[PDB]
From a paper:
PfRh5 forms a complex with cysteine-rich protective antigen (CyRPA) and P. falciparum Rh5 interacting protein (PfRipr). Within the β-propeller structure are four intra-sheet disulfide bonds (Cys19-Cys35, Cys90-Cys92, Cys151-Cys169 and Cys229-Cys239) and one inter-sheet disulfide bond (Cys274-Cys298).
The crystal of uncomplexed CyRPA contains four copies of the protein in the crystallographic asymmetric unit, arranged with approximate 222-point group symmetry. Within this tetramer, a pairwise association of CyRPA molecules is mediated by the formation of two eight-strand anti-parallel β-sheets, one (termed sheet ‘6–6’) comprises two copies of the sixth β-sheet of the CyRPA monomer and the second (termed sheet ‘5–5’) comprises two copies of the (adjacent) fifth β-sheet of the CyRPA monomer. In each case, formation of the eight-stranded sheet is mediated by the respective outermost strands of the two constituent four-stranded sheets. These dimers of CyRPA monomers then associate with each other via the formation of a β-sandwich comprising sheet 6–6 of one CyRPA dimer and sheet 6–6 of the second CyRPA dimer. However, we cannot rule out such associations occurring within the hetero-complexes formed by CyRPA and its partner proteins on the surface of the merozoite.
Numbering used by the authors: 1 to 38, 45 to 92, 99 to 161, 164 to 288, 297 to 332
């Protein structure tokens, strides 16, 4: 590591919509955000200048009840968002769009879906490339398992841009804990490698600790994932990403998240100090990334990071 370049720039973005949950993704060198607003609305927002602008509300297109699950898949030319209601068949609504502003409506359904027991949550991700096939993943985790049986994590995939979900991805997680709650399973597909970032409840300390597991390609459609250790004393793990083919991990000083730290390959460090709770990475390219949190209501501190190592 002869040459190491690190530089961060702080920017602020204001939003007129109070989002319960935030989902950020970049597309064609532009930052987007799927925002949930509770009449309940689901706005698609694009970042221009110093503020979020609302492009289109897609919840009004279906007229669901309550807050639905959101599965957004970003590709190089198209964006695909699925709104699934929170029976035996999964009822979703698949939206297609080559441009960011206008979306095509289409109601879909999955017969005898495998994720009836599993706890699923919202996330954005990109196609998972296996050989010459590209898959969209709807993943779930069983939120609790009293005694041992073993598909604790399983994803249903689609190689057709989300119209037929008949494909199944096996996730062999040998370290799934009995008698413990799992909360926020999201797949992290950097490059063409599958990874998972979820939460585990520690019943003796009463704390939700994040877990990160790397997956390898054992079989063509079956993966073997094991835990990756990012624990460091007196600091709570937050988010994980990859820059320069190296892990960049966000930490918090404590569970109050008064100040956030970012470590590059577990050696270099940057201290972020405004509450930075809810901060998440948005990878722009292989050497740039974003760090977005909301220190107060109606604003978003975005930290643009450049990391390099020759």
């Amino acid at each position: 590591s002869r040459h190491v370049f690190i530089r961060t720039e702080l920017s602020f973005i204001k939003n007129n919509v109070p989002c319960i949950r935030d989902m950020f993704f970049i597309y064609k060198r532009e930052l987007y955000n799927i925002c949930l607003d509770d009449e309940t609305h689901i706005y698609v927002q694009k970042k221009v200048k110093d503020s979020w602008i609302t492009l289109n509300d897609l919840f009004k297109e279906t007229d669901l009840t309550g807050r639905p699950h959101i599965f957004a898949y970003v590709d190089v030319e198209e964006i695909i968002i699925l709104l699934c209601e929170d029976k035996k068949d999964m009822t979703c609504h698949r939206f297609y769009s080559n441009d960011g502003k206008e979306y095509n409506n289409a109601e879909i359904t999955i017969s005898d879906y495998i994720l009836k027991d599993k706890l699923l949550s919202s996330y954005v991700s990109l196609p998972l490339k296996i050989e010459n096939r590209e898959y969209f993943l709807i993943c779930g985790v069983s939120p609790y398992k009293f005694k041992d049986d073993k598909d604790d994590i399983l994803c249903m995939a689609s190689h057709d841009k989300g119209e037929t979900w008949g494909t199944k991805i096996v996730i062999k997680y040998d370290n799934y804990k009995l008698g413990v709650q799992y909360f926020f399973l999201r797949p992290y597909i950097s490059k063409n490698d599958l990874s998972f970032h979820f939460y585990v409840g520690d019943n003796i300390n009463n704390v939700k600790n994040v877990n990160f597991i790397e997956c390898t390609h054992e079989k063509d459609l079956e993966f073997v994932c094991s835990n990756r250790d990012f624990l460091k004393d007196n600091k709570v793990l937050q988010d994980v990403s990859t820059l320069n083919d190296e892990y960049i991990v966000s930490y918090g000083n404590d569970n109050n998240f008064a100040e956030c730290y970012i470590f590059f390959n577990n050696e270099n460090s940057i201290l972020i100090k405004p509450g930075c709770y809810g901060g998440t990475f948005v990878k722009i390219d292989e050497n740039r990334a974003l760090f977005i949190y909301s220190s107060s209501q109606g604003i978003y501190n975005i930290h643009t990071i450049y990391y390099a190592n020759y």
